[PDB]
Amino acid sequence: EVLKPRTLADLIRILHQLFAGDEVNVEEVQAIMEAYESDPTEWAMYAKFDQYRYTRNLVDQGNGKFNLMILCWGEGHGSSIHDHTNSHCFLKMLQGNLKETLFAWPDKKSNEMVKKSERVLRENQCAYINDSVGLHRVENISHTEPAVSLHLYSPPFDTCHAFDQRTGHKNKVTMTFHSKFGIRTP
């Protein structure tokens, strides 16, 4: 009874419908994203890697309702601990595996940050986060194989905060795209 997209194109079309209105059913979106069976032939044109850091590759702008992007994680690549600027955030595995560590929000005093959950995202799994759930870090579990993930953020946002695990202190970070629609950016 979960609508199953047969292609990434199908999934994008469904997402346009599901985010067209004022309400978004998080569990419905998550189930449909998870139901799409990752097919590298369909997303290889977005899978542009970098030697030193993960890359952000824009796929679709969702008629202004969301950003859909593919993140390419080289061997051992991981993110900072970060927030999500008051948006819905869906993360689906396309290749490999990411470990997601959920963190509590710091208070004003400097302190080591507190882990609230730790898990590995499985093949084709779609996870969900927003600022009320917590902060998180994601990282490629493998030092010999890449990981690829599909991220949907709604509403779109271009900045977030990164947090220092030792103190809780944060810095504003402007997100940049490595490519858009399969075309490398300057």
For residues 59 and 36, the answer to whether their CB atoms sit within 8 Å is: no
Q: Any binding-site annotation on 169? A: no
Taking the C-alpha atoms of residue 158 and residue 177, their distance in angstroms, rounded to an integer, is 10
Taking the C-alpha atoms of residue 68 and residue 98, their distance in angstroms, rounded to an integer, is 18
Q: Any binding-site annotation on 143? A: no
E strand map for the chain = 55-60, 67-73, 81-82, 88-95, 98-103, 115-121, 126-129, 135-140, 147-154, 159-163, 170-174, 179-180, 183-184
Q: Any binding-site annotation on 88? A: no
Which residues partner with 154 through β-bridges? 88
Could you tell me which residues are annotated as the binding site? Answer: 82, 84, 136
Could you tell me which residues are annotated as the binding site for Fe cation? Answer: 82, 84, 136
